[PDB]
Amino acid sequence: MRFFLSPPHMGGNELKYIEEVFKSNYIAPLGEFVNRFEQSVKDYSKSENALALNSATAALHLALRVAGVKQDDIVLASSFTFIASVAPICYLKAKPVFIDCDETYNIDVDLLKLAIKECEKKPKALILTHLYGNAAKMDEIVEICKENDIVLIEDAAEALGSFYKNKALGTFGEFGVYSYNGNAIITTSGGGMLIGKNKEKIEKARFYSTQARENCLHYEHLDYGYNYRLSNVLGAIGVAQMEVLEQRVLKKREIYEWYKEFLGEYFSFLDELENSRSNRWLSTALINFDKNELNSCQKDINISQKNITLHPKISKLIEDLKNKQIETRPLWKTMHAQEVFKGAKAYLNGNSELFFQKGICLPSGTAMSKDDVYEISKLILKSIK
Amino acid sequence: MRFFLSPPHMGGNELKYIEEVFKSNYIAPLGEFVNRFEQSVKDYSKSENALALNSATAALHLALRVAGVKQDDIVLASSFTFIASVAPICYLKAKPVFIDCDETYNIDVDLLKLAIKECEKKPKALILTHLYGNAAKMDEIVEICKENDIVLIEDAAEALGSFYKNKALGTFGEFGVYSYNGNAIITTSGGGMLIGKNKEKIEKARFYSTQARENCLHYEHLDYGYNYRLSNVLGAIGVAQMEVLEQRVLKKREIYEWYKEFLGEYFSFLDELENSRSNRWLSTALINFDKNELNSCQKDINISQKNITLHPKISKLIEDLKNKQIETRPLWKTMHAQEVFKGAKAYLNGNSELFFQKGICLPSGTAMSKDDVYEISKLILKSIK
Numbered sequence: 203m204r205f206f207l208s209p210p211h212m213g214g215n216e217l218k219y220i221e222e223v224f225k226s227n228y229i230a231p232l233g234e235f236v237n238r239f240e241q242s243v244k245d246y247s248k249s250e251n252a253l254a255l256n257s258a259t260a261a262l263h264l265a266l267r268v269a270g271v272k273q274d275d276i277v278l279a280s281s282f283t284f285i286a287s288v289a290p291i292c293y294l295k296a297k298p299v300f301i302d303c304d305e306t307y308n309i310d311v312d313l314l315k316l317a318i319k320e321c322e323k324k325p326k327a328l329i330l331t332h333l334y335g336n337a338a339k340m341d342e343i344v345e346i347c348k349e350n351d352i353v354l355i356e357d358a359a360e361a362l363g364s365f366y367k368n369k370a371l372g373t374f375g376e377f378g379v380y381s382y383n384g385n386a387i388i389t390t391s392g393g394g395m396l397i398g399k400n401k402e403k404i405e406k407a408r409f410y411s412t413q414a415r416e417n418c419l420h421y422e423h424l425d426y427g428y429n430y431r432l433s434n435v436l437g438a439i440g441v442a443q444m445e446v447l448e449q450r451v452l453k454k455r456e457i458y459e460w461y462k463e464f465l466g467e468y469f470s471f472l473d474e475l476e477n478s479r480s481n482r483w484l485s486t487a488l489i490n491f492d493k494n495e496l497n498s499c500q501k502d503i504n505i506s507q508k509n510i511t512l513h514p515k516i517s518k519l520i521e522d523l524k525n526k527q528i529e530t531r532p533l534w535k536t537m538h539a540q541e542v543f544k545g546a547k548a549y550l551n552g553n554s555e556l557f558f559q560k561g562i563c564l565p566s567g568t569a570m571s572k573d574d575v576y577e578i579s580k581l582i583l584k585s586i587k
Numbered sequence: 588m589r590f591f592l593s594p595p596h597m598g599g600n601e602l603k604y605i606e607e608v609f610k611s612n613y614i615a616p617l618g619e620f621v622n623r624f625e626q627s628v629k630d631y632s633k634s635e636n637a638l639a640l641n642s643a644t645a646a647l648h649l650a651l652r653v654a655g656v657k658q659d660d661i662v663l664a665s666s667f668t669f670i671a672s673v674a675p676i677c678y679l680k681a682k683p684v685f686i687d688c689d690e691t692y693n694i695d696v697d698l699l700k701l702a703i704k705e706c707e708k709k710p711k712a713l714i715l716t717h718l719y720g721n722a723a724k725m726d727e728i729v730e731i732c733k734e735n736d737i738v739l740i741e742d743a744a745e746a747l748g749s750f751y752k753n754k755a756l757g758t759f760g761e762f763g764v765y766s767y768n769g770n771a772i773i774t775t776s777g778g779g780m781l782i783g784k785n786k787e788k789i790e791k792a793r794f795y796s797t798q799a800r801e802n803c804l805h806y807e808h809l810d811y812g813y814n815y816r817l818s819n820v821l822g823a824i825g826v827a828q829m830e831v832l833e834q835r836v837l838k839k840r841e842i843y844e845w846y847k848e849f850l851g852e853y854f855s856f857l858d859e860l861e862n863s864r865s866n867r868w869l870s871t872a873l874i875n876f877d878k879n880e881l882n883s884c885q886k887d888i889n890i891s892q893k894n895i896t897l898h899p900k901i902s903k904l905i906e907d908l909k910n911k912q913i914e915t916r917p918l919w920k921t922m923h924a925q926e927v928f929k930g931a932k933a934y935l936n937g938n939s940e941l942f943f944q945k946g947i948c949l950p951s952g953t954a955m956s957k958d959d960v961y962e963i964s965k966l967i968l969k970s971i972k
């Protein structure tokens with residue numbers, strides 16, 4: 203393939219810091235660059251607490267554990283998301299209630315109110331995805347969660363570098379998670395950060411992350427925990443990648459603006475919320491789309507596996523570009539159509555399914571030039587007419 | 588500290604292979620060195636299947652999941668072990684039944700038979716620790732598990748490089764796990780390998796390891812999974828470390844033989860099983876110990892948190908050596924005395940608690956010379972008389 207969605211983009215101080223790790227001989231999930239990695243996420247996000255982990259999935263698992271979610275507790279979540287977001291609900295055997303999205307790709311604010319209202323019992327938490335870097339309607343969701351005493355866990359796994367009203371996505375919730383998996387805006391080759399408001403709670407996540415050891419020489423355990431802690435070698439990568447995070451954000455936004463410029467007449471590019479700044483982690487576009495097709499229903503279902511057919515120009519577009527060795531992908535297939543979540547409760551308004559029909563993820567690698575985006579865009583244009 | 592239990596010992600091709608990873612641009616939990624890492628574990632262990640993961644804890648979690656352990660299923664396990672071994676029982680909300688150890692530090696064979704006999708229902712699996720690299724009585728345990736249709740999962744997390752009757756520890760069970768955490772005989776700075784007999788099953792673990800995706804472009808999920816997959820950068824480390832594994836094994840055994848030579852008159856060093864080869868991951872020694880103190884009881888309890896006092900010469904020995912900047916540690920404090928496992932069923936014969944009293948983990952780093960071991964040993968001798 204010539205172009206991937208969002209491959210690694212390295213070329214900083216990664217090797218240099220890794221060599222410092224080798225010199226230290228802390229070849230372990232702890233050490234100076236774990237610490238520095240967490241410092242850098244605090245410096246950037248302005249969250250006061252950060253815990254370097256091996257994945258954002260782990261971060262969410264810990265956020266939920268530390269929030270006191272138990273078996274059969276209700277956890278609200280975004281339907282329009284990647285399964286990692288909600289897999290931890292399954293780990294804790296909590297009961298997921300999935301909620302459709304709005305014009306930002308994120309949980310719809312009125313559906314949220316509906317879903318909470320109709321829970322058979324007070325929901326304990328909400329995992330809010332910020333899909334593709336886009337901010338959800340935070341003042342509203344935050345307030346709703348405050349009003350209902352719902353722990354907000356922002357899943358900003360795709361949204362490191364996104365902002366709403368000058369605040370880092372991740373810093374509104376009690377908890378925030380960022381991914382540094384291989385295709386994230388920056389990477390540790392696999393990694394994550396759990397940030398949060400409560401220093402005790404984060405430090406409790408920290409305790410869980412290293413097998414729930416009491417502070418003593420022998421092994422003493424009042425609870426059970428995990429091995430979730432991030433490798434210091436990978437922490438080094440994290441540090442060097444954090445050095446270019448903002449540069450990456452700035453570039454992903456340029457690439458999106460380019461796509462808009464080359465494809466604007468023929469695709470719909472939904473706007474980020476005024477008073478936000480999406481990291482545009484992937485540039486996405488909707489074909490044959492009118493915003494007034496949104497909210498074509500308001501219902502709750504028990505989920506069944508559902509086959510959703512791509513708009514024909516999307517499936518052709520994917521195939522055409524694949525033949526020219528350009529990776530594109532459908533938008534995330536809603537959890538409300540997934541077999542894994544058979545039986546679980548979901549609120550629909552039609553939107554996530556409609557986005558899956560008409561949407562596409564475009565190559566958004568920050569190593570691409572304008573000319574790259576240009577040649578990709580004209581193959582996209584060739585394909586559709 | 589001048590000497591740690593088992594720090595990283597690098598100095599091979601680690602940086603070289605990491606640089607190859609950077610050149611590849613697979614800065615992700617997949618790629619060539621993940622693959623090569625798994626190949627090397629197959630070449631060495633002779634297991635036909637290997638799955639590179641971020642920890643041995645993950646490996647065990649997957650071994651249990653894939654074995655079909657469900658909530659409230661009984662899982663037998665070693666008491667004398669590190670909590671990571673049994674934490675996955677907790678993840679699946681299975682019911683642990685812990686079993687005391689014999690003169691090898693591993694599950695006693697008769698107690699095992701007892702515990703199985705008295706289970707309120709057929710136990711689904713057994714997680715057998717091979718403590719400190721030492722082989723448990725495999726022909727017996729294997730047979731017992733076969734007879735009772737118990738899935739044997741060897742926890743060889745500490746025993747990479749150990750053998751029983753010419754077979755790699757890890758390759759007797761349906762599943763085997765190895766750790767490459769920061770203090771293991773070799774390291775990836777955090778990592779593990781799930782090996783096993785059944786290629787389907789291992790590949791099923793593989794599927795779970797990357798979020799349980801159906802093989803298609805869009806995201807389609809019939810089940811939920813994890814993010815457990817190992818980083819390719821760390822895989823590179825694994826490959827280069829696997830190149831010295833046997834050398835390390837050979838060295839750990841030398842160091843043990845040295846400790847025996849310098850401390851033999853004053854400590855008891857229990858022998859590995861004839862027709863085995865322990866990796867001697869840590870050199871361990873028992874003070875004021877007679878083998879006939881073993882099996883001083885045969886009872887089942889419901890666990891309560893129990894304070895076990897070190898033999899005074901052990902606690903003094905630890906303090907004395909700590910003051911000379913040498914790390915020593917007690918032996919692993921049995922799960923049958925841990926608060927976390929309050930209420931759970933445990934079979935005792937006295938042995939694990941007696942080993943905790945009189946035992947010590949000695950510095951066993953493979954970078955140590957004979958002179959190092961010598962100077963450590965005479966400080967040990969100074970301390971005890």
Ligand SMILES: CC(=O)N[C@H]1[C@@H](OP(=O)(O)OP(=O)(O)OC[C@H]2O[C@@H](n3ccc(=O)[nH]c3=O)[C@H](O)[C@@H]2O)O[C@H](C)[C@@H](/N=C/c2c(COP(=O)(O)O)cnc(C)c2O)[C@@H]1O
Pocket residue numbers: 206208209210256257258259260283284286287331357359360380381382383384385386393394611612613614615616617797798800814
């Ligand atoms: C391995 C990887 O990159 N995983 C991310 C990805 O999953 P998936 O689509 O299954 O992965 P693939 O694209 O098949 O993986 C191929 C890898 O090869 C790499 N690559 C390819 C070519 C090359 O030359 N070099 C290279 O390295 C790619 O950049 C990529 O990382 O796509 C998802 C959208 C991401 N989402 C994670 C997520 C979580 C959980 O984060 P966690 O992954 O646990 O940190 C929580 N919530 C939400 C809303 C999330 O979205 C995953 O982190």
Ligand SMILES: CC(=O)N[C@H]1[C@@H](OP(=O)(O)OP(=O)(O)OC[C@H]2O[C@@H](n3ccc(=O)[nH]c3=O)[C@H](O)[C@@H]2O)O[C@H](C)[C@@H](/N=C/c2c(COP(=O)(O)O)cnc(C)c2O)[C@@H]1O
Pocket residue numbers: 226227228229230231232412413415429591593594595641642643644645668669671672716742744745765766767768769770771778779
């Ligand atoms: C981080 C680490 O090394 N963890 C291993 C260790 O846990 P713990 O005692 O809490 O760790 P500490 O010694 O406090 O960690 C300090 C780290 O700093 C490193 N270090 C220190 C000085 C230096 O200069 N450089 C340096 O890097 C050390 O080598 C060490 O790795 O000691 C346990 C005995 C190991 N056991 C794991 C296990 C599992 C699960 O394996 P997993 O860890 O999930 O791969 C399943 N079953 C069984 C029977 C197991 O035993 C853990 O893998």
